[model samples]
Target chain A: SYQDYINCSREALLEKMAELLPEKRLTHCLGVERAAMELAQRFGVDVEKASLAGLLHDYAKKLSDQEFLVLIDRYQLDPDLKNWGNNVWHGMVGIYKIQEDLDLHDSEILRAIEIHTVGAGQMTDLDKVIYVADYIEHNRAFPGVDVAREIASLSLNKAVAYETARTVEYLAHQGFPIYPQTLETYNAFVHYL
Target chain B: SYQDYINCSREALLEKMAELLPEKRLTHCLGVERAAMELAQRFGVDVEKASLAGLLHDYAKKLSDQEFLVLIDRYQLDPDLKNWGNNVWHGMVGIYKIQEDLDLHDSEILRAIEIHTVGAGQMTDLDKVIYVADYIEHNRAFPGVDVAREIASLSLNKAVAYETARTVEYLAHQGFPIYPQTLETYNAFVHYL
Candidate 1:
């Protein structure tokens, strides 16, 4: 049974997914899925679980900004959610759909989706491992992301807290609208600072 | 005995004292002193010992920028101290002065002054009290000073760490000079971060 699940390569599932999804969306979904699979294997998590999570992580990413907000609010999701109507909203919504509609009960995969945006407090190792991988996937290259990934390899908690602190400092400097959950999560991680 | 007390204060001690120094400079010095004294009283440190540290803590304030640099280089101080001539430098200079000039034999008093700026690593009770007082004094008046001062009254170590982290973030954002000592001190305090 385990071998059967492991044999479902991300490339194969993504090819099928591409047929139903648009070009860019399919590409990003596959990219994140590939990253998750590699990371899960590297970090000693279940390969199949990671593959499924990656493939389905962006399941609702194609929705329009307005559509995504309606779906999230309709479900009474995190009230602190921002109205930015960003892809991050879809990440949260996709997690909800995975558990409610698809009957997937793996808390690890579900949590990875739920926290992909602002992050959950008391982070599960799975949550940190996937969140970090997604943020610094081989294809992504934001300033300081390299150092972040390097730190992640050494200490998970340190990497998580550093990322949160960096985000808060940058967001404040930019005068951006800080989603409260992100602020709260950042502060919770940084309070001992 | 005369040579031994070379750096001893010539002016007799006075409670309501005024310095020949500039008004603003004098005020800042008084503020640091008042805060340090309160901390000393609360921690049951000898007021005379506390006053000595408090009074000399900013001795380099009167030094010209060039003079400060010469003193710093003479001491073979941490290279980081010269990068920013702010609160942290005063701490280093004060420590050097107490050791070289005053010949103060009490290492505890000298150490209390030394780390007051960046916070002593895993500080003693007096270290926390003095560091917090200097940060949260009535005249300190910064964004988070109120909360920091309140926290200071409750848990000394946590407050010191929190205040130190805030200082690091503030200094980084301001694009001012940065020193490795500040970086190291910040790292030491913010292990959770």
Candidate 2:
């Protein structure tokens, strides 16, 4: 399952990323893929799956407005999604778009990408690998990045909790409206204060 | 009610403070009382009530082991409280002790101290005053204290929300177990992000 996807599926995925994603986003994807693979290998997750999920995670990030809306209506996704914009749509709606184009039906890899933007309450190890990787990718520098990197290899669960807590705090500090589940994920998954 | 309480009630409160509180805590109370008065005046609240609540907020902070346990089971406070320590009891159980010793009966003042520890979903201006004042008191120095003080006068609602968000994040960072209501207060009171 792993090598089959790595050997064959990666070519199409790389082609799609080059065709649709800008160089900047493509670069970020590459970094995330690297980080995800490292995390996957450390955590005993499927490295191939991590790489695939990272490369395709932001596949729908740069879609045109009409394209996103068409997909929303075509797939009959959450109606309330109409209220949010790309900051949210790219994550929650990315899976549907990726599936439609790439025909990537591997649920675990898709689930990893699905949560790469806004994390979920429950996550498989691969889901966490991608989620934590996206935050601590080599290019992702911020006040807490080093601390996150320090904890990344120790415990995925702690890393997820750390990222969620910081994300929620950073969102509130900026006066941005937090996605409802983002806060729920923090509350539900936080094992410590 | 405000001036009348100040005229007589403050004398006994001062005497109790001199008797029980060590100079360090007494110093903090004085700073908090000063901050509370300043905040109350800015927000059109009762300055005297703010002072009184500030002085009495940590009234139960240093109770003996038997004293806190006796009060909890004696008044039948949430039995679940026994599982926590003075860090919790001083705030949750302080009101009963203050009332018993000082015979203070002002519900608003009591409520303000009751929530001084783990804030509530709803708060009056006085409650906001004491809560924010405790965190940004004159001698208090921390990374975020200045920001908290800057916002304390802008909008008590914003101040309360900011303090709650920071407190929860800090608690999480320290790996301490947060009281349930603290998280709820942050979620409920946070109007932005």
Candidate 3:
């Protein structure tokens, strides 16, 4: 299945994806799709979910607010994964729309996208690894990314827990919106002692 | 030896330190001292170095530029460690002053205080632990502190590495005054393989 997806050239993939996504987001999707497939190959997991999840993680990301809501209603997107103008919600919408539109059904892929934004501190090991792969991707460069990138190889749990706490702290400090479930998930991780 | 330092009450430790430090710096010193002690206990390191380093860490912290340079002239300051005003100097000054004023011959005690600000990635276990302890000490609160605090209990190496990166990133982002040595130190700690 993954071979079918990978055999296509990048230009072909981009051309096919152009109808469903804005140009900027589609480019980002292709980048993440390539990253996800490479990472899945290295880690020995399901390349299909990783590739598809990456390709569609931002499927509805560029829609206007009204369009986003209408699409959500039409697709019956899960409210539990709403981003509320925060950046974390795009992952969930990707999962919901992919399954609904493309007939792709896999809870693991959906969970990877859903939990990435809010970063349920109690992520499954796979969830932890993939979310981190997305965050500390080789292509993404941000200030303070070098340390996180180096740390990606040492331990997934440490990296995920570190990133989750940091994300929460950053959001709080910036007075950004926070999801209660994410906080609850972080709290659950605390007792994992 | 550290047991002798720990037996003193917090108030007693603060009082003794006040004689060597400015009143304003005394407050920060006490904060670091307490944090260092907590970390010392957690890691089973010598509490004396932690406490003394905490107490003397800011021995020259509040001095004016003239006063800071005067100490430098007296060979009381190490040029090799001089980085960005007195932000990095205080610890080095303390190590020198503590040895001169209090007859502290313990290398561990001196090194702990010396490199508190510019972390040495391969520091002695006690040295690494106390440097971080003084930073995220009990009273310190900032926006990412919740995550910092959680990681504190997990591993000394990870916590210090995080703090070292955070300090470099924060200082650079704010365009604060920074010394070259301090920058190099940060790179060393963060670049560890």
Best of the candidates, DockQ: 2
Model 2: colliding residue pairs: A193-B172
Candidate 1, residues A1-193, lDDT tens digits: the string is 2224334444655564576578866666667677777666767777666666666666666656666566668888765554455645766666665455455666777887777767766777667666666665666678988887787666666666677667656653443433445544564565323
Q: Model 3 chain B: which ten-residue window has the lowest total lDDT?
A: B172-181
CA lDDT of each candidate?
0.61, 0.80, 0.62
DockQ per candidate: 0.04, 0.16, 0.02
To one decimal, what is the Cα RMSD in angstroms of model 1 from the true structure?
Answer: 13.6
Docking class of 3: incorrect
Off by over 4 Å in 3: A1-193, B1-13, B19-24, B76-83, B191-193
Per-residue lDDT of candidate 2, residues B4-44 (tens digit): 54434565566768788888888898888999999999999
lDDT of 1 at A102: 52
DockQ-derived CAPRI band for the predicted complex in model 2? incorrect
Worst 10 residues of 2 chain A by lDDT: A1-10
TM-score, candidate number 3: 0.45
TM values, all candidates: 0.48, 0.72, 0.45
Candidates sorted on TM-score, descending: 2, 1, 3
- CA shift of A131, model 2, Å: 1.7
Candidate 1, residue A25: how far the Cα is off, in Å: 13
Clashes of 3: 1
